[PDB]
Structures are given as structure tokens and as C-alpha cells.
Amino acid sequence: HMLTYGAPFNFPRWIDEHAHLLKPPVGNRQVWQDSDFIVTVVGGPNHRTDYHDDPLEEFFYQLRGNAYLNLWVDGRRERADLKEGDIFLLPPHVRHSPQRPEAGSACLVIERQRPAGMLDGFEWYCDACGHLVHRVEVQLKSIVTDLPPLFESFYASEDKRRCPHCGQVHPGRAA
Amino acid sequence: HMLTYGAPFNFPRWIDEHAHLLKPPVGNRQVWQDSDFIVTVVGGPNHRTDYHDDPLEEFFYQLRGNAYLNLWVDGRRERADLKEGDIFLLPPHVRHSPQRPEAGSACLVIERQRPAGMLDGFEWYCDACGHLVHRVEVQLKSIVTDLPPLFESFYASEDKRRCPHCGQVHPGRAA
Ligand SMILES: N=C(C(=O)O)/C(=C\C=C/O)C(=O)O
Ligand SMILES: N=C(C(=O)O)/C(=C\C=C/O)C(=O)O
Ligand SMILES: [Fe+2]
Ligand SMILES: [Fe+2]
Ligand SMILES: [Fe+2]
Ligand SMILES: [Fe+2]
């Protein structure tokens, strides 16, 4: 039947043409709408303090510039570098916090639409003792409608930010 | 928990290092094993006469060289060009026959593991009248174990190759 997502098109020129969105305050841009594969380009700079718990895999291809992922691997904080040219496949539920220090960077990220009932988690961890400070689970439909208010409500709440283990109040927006 | 699929790694150098498999007789190479996202690099030259009917989406990013897809769109034969640098998202069930004339070409193709019961189709069409000549449906586990014998059994069988509409016997392996 129909090429529902349109014809093939030149990706570098698309990234060039959307450079103004691959920077603060927007930072990323989904390529196709209403598809099963969620295909996004993510730019920079953006730093962030949440860890994502994705119930499905995520594919990364760092096309331009460098970035890295703060991870929880086997109970310990680790870093996975996404150097320019690198590809990477993240297994389900590995906690990850992408850090994207460079302007002009661009990373292809491919994920799957989550089926009804399969929820995403977003988590913050205590800088002092490492315990989990706060988790929100969300039926994720769009990283535009369902996600910013989630982060904003954490920054706005000393209670949400308060470590249950040691009482230290997480800093909120910037580490 | 674990980085089950390993650390990030440089993709161009991987493609360089696997160049000897991105050519006849192998032609392609899956990047990671036992993952939900099936991530493959496909090289050339390869021409082929089957149309794939994939019950899920396929993502294409033609990294090196040029290729194209013969399609059935809205009842008519069409061609979608994959020029170097192009990306493309194919909707489910659009019949497609990839043609990869160039040596040294490389296309990133990402698909999903099909769940039990969701079958792939492989189809051949009559050059003369355009009617369907033969379809095989397969629970696809690997494009290495389940796929070559399927194609080989079509080439080996004048009966399978015989157009039901006009009686013309499809040529088999090479158009
Ligand atoms: N990989 C993510 C994600 O954490 O799901 C991302 C950007 C937005 C959507 O993927 C990023 O900055 O890499
Ligand atoms: N896109 C395919 C497919 O038809 O599923 C392919 C190679 C092998 C696996 O995808 C190709 O040559 O593009
Ligand atoms: Fe994520
Ligand atoms: Fe703490
Ligand atoms: Fe296919
Ligand atoms: Fe025919």
C-alpha cells in the first residue's frame, strides 16, 4: 500500500536544516510521527540529572560530536562514552542518564513505541549515599507532552528531592 | 544490570573490518546477537528477485554507496532510491525487493524480532502479467538458517515458478 512515512531523504541535510531545534531549549527532534520505531536526533548542549529506565532497547549512533551516558551497571555508577562515530545498543532497564556537552552534536536514537501497560521509569539518585531518591513511572506517549512536567515537578519539590536514606536534598535541575 | 551487548564501538571501523563479509557470497552481517532490535549492515553487489512482506517496520540508513528498493505501492511497481546518506522508514507489509548494485556499499538496516505467530512473507511476481507467482510465509528466526533454502526451493521448482495467471515460468535466481 502507501509509503506512510514518505520517500527516502538525505539525513545530513535534514540534520543541518533542523540545527536550530538540536540546541536549547528543544534539543531533540523526532524524524517520523505515528510510527512504531521512534526515531529521534538529539543535539546539545544538554546535561541532566534523571536516569531513564526503559522497558525496551535503545539504539544509539553518535553521528556528530561526542556525548556520554551515566549508567548504573551491576550496582555501580559507570560511564559509557559515545564518541563521534560510535554505535551502541542499550539493553532494557539499564538506568541511563545522557550527557551531551557539545553544541552541534547529533545522535541518532531509535526506540520502540511502548505497548499499553509497559511503563517507563524516571529516577534520581542521591549524590551523597547513592540511594534512590525518587522514581516516577509513566505510560510514555511522547517525550514532549508527558516528560517535562514530570521533571519540573521533581525540581519543584523538596519532598520529592529528599533522600530517604541520609536526608540530603537532591539539587534538582543542575547537578 | 549488565551491558549485555557490550560497550559502544566505532561503526565505520567495524564496517571496514567486516568488508569481506559485506560482499558475495555473504553480503550482510548482523551487529548484535539475541537482541530485540535486529541491527544489520548490508553490502553489495546483490540483486534479487524476491519481494519481502515484513509484518513490522524497517529502518534504512544508506551509509556508503547507493542502492534501491523495488516496491509495490498502491498496486503498481515503484522504485525507492537509497542514495548515499539517505534514511527511510518502510511501513509494515509494503512489498520490497532490495537491489544493491555497488561493491563497497553499506546500508544500516534495523528491524524488530517478530513475536511468535507473526509471520514474514517472501513473494515473487510475474514479469509478464504482474500476478503473484508464489508466496512462502516463514516464522523468521534468522536470515541465515530459515531464508536461503526458501529461495533455493523456488529456483529449483518450475511448478513454484509458474505464473497461475498467464502460465509464464518465472526466471528464478537472476531477473
Ligand atoms: N536516549 C535518550 C532516552 O534517554 O530515551 C535521549 C534522548 C530522547 C529520547 O530517546 C538521549 O539524549 O540520548
Ligand atoms: N532490508 C532488508 C530486508 O529486506 O529485511 C535487507 C537485507 C537483510 C535483512 O534486513 C536489504 O538488502 O536491505
Ligand atoms: Fe532512554
Ligand atoms: Fe542519600
Ligand atoms: Fe525486508
Ligand atoms: Fe503471468
From Swiss-Prot, chains A, B:
UniProt binding sites for substrate: 58, 100, 111
Binding site for Fe cation 2: 126, 129, 163, 166
Keyword Oxidoreductase listed: yes
Biological pathway: Cofactor biosynthesis; NAD(+) biosynthesis; quinolinate from L-kynurenine: step 3/3
Molecular function GO terms recorded: 3-hydroxyanthranilate 3,4-dioxygenase activity; ferrous iron binding
Keywords, in A-Z order: Dioxygenase, Iron, Metal-binding, Oxidoreductase, Plasmid, Pyridine nucleotide biosynthesis
CDD domains named among the record's database cross-references: cupin_HAO
Pfam family, one: 3-HAO
Superkingdom, taxonomy of origin: Bacteria
Cofactor note: Binds 2 Fe(2+) ions per subunit.
Residues annotated for O2 binding in this entry: 48
One GO process term, biological-process aspect: quinolinate biosynthetic process
Activity regulation info: Inhibited by 4-chloro-3-hydroxyanthranilate. Mechanism of inactivation involves the oxidation of the catalytic active site Fe(2+) to the catalytically inactive Fe(3+) oxidation state, superoxide production, and formation of two disulfide bonds between Cys-126 and Cys-129, and Cys-163 and Cys-166. Enzyme can be reactivated under reducing conditions.
Names of required cofactors: Fe(2+)
Group of enzyme by EC: oxidoreductase
Keyword rRNA-binding among UniProt keywords: no
Residues that, per the record, bind Fe cation 1: 52, 58, 96
The protein's Enzyme Commission number: 1.13.11.6
Catalytic activities: 3-hydroxyanthranilate + O2 = (2Z,4Z)-2-amino-3-carboxymuconate 6-semialdehyde
PANTHER family hit by this protein: 3-HYDROXYANTHRANILATE 3,4-DIOXYGENASE
Task of the protein: Catalyzes the oxidative ring opening of 3-hydroxyanthranilate to 2-amino-3-carboxymuconate semialdehyde, which spontaneously cyclizes to quinolinate.
NCBIfam families xref list: anthran_nbaC, PRK13264.1
Similarity annotation: Belongs to the 3-HAO family.
Protein name: 3-hydroxyanthranilate 3,4-dioxygenase
Gene source species: Cupriavidus metallidurans (strain ATCC 43123 / DSM 2839 / NBRC 102507 / CH34)
Gene name linked to the record: nbaC
